[PDB]
């Protein structure tokens, strides 16, 4: 019944997840053609200082599978290379229900932010959606997308 914000057990966030919500401070990046519209499948620890991710994305309308490794720095803060340099942190999680991620992308333009909600089931309550939208508004993010109303490459999983 229990919300963790501090000393995240990365053996306990591992396994199967789904992408539920997406928000940015730049609307074009979270669009049908944007390269940051990705759908998570699987998370695993490789050691105390590496997380594995598996995603799907659409490239010229065709579903494609990607594998990345992210490197740890302090507790709960990670770096990864993909369409530029990225830094992100796990804000809060319930190990058997949901995860909230806050991410920053560099490129060579000005930086932008992404916030992501993942869940163990492919949809969630209105109560949890309202919680996400509140966190985004408290940090000045206004562009918010429900991915349960859109193709998320579900037929490609397993």
Kindly list the distances between the CA atom of residue 129 and the CA atoms of 9, 16, 105, in Å, as whole numbers in the listed order: 24, 20, 24
Which structural technique was applied?
A: X-ray
Instruction: Give the start-to-end residue ranges of the domains of the chain.
Output: 1-158
Cα–Cα distance measured from residue 11 to residue 34, given in angstroms and rounded to the nearest whole number: 31
Documented resolution in Å: 3.0
CA gyration radius, the chain: 15
- Cα dihedral 44/50/69/57 (nearest 10): 40
Cα–Cα distance measured from residue 96 to residue 33, given in angstroms and rounded to the nearest whole number: 32
Sign of torsion over alpha carbons 64, 144, 10, 68: positive
User: For the chain, how far is it from start to end, CA to CA, in angstroms?
Assistant: 28
């Amino acid at each position: 019944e229990n919300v963790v914000r501090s000393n995240i057990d990365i053996s306990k966030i591992s396994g199967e997840w789904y992408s539920i919500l997406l928000a940015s401070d730049v609307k074009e990046k979270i669009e049908e053609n944007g390269s940051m519209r990705v759908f998570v499948e699987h998370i695993k620890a490789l050691d105390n200082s590496s997380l594995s991710f598996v995603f799907h994305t659409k490239e010229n309308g065709k579903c494609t599978e990607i594998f990345l490794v992210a490197d740890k720095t302090k507790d709960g803060v990670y770096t990864v290379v993909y369409d530029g340099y990225n830094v992100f942190s796990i804000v809060e999680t319930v190990y058997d229900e949901y995860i909230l991620l806050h991410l920053l992308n560099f490129d060579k333009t000005r930086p932008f932010q992404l916030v992501e909600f993942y869940a163990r089931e492919p949809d969630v309550s209105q109560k949890l959606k309202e919680k996400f939208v509140k966190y985004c508004q408290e940090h000045g993010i206004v562009n918010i997308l429900d991915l349960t109303e859109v193709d998320r490459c579900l037929q490609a999983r397993g």
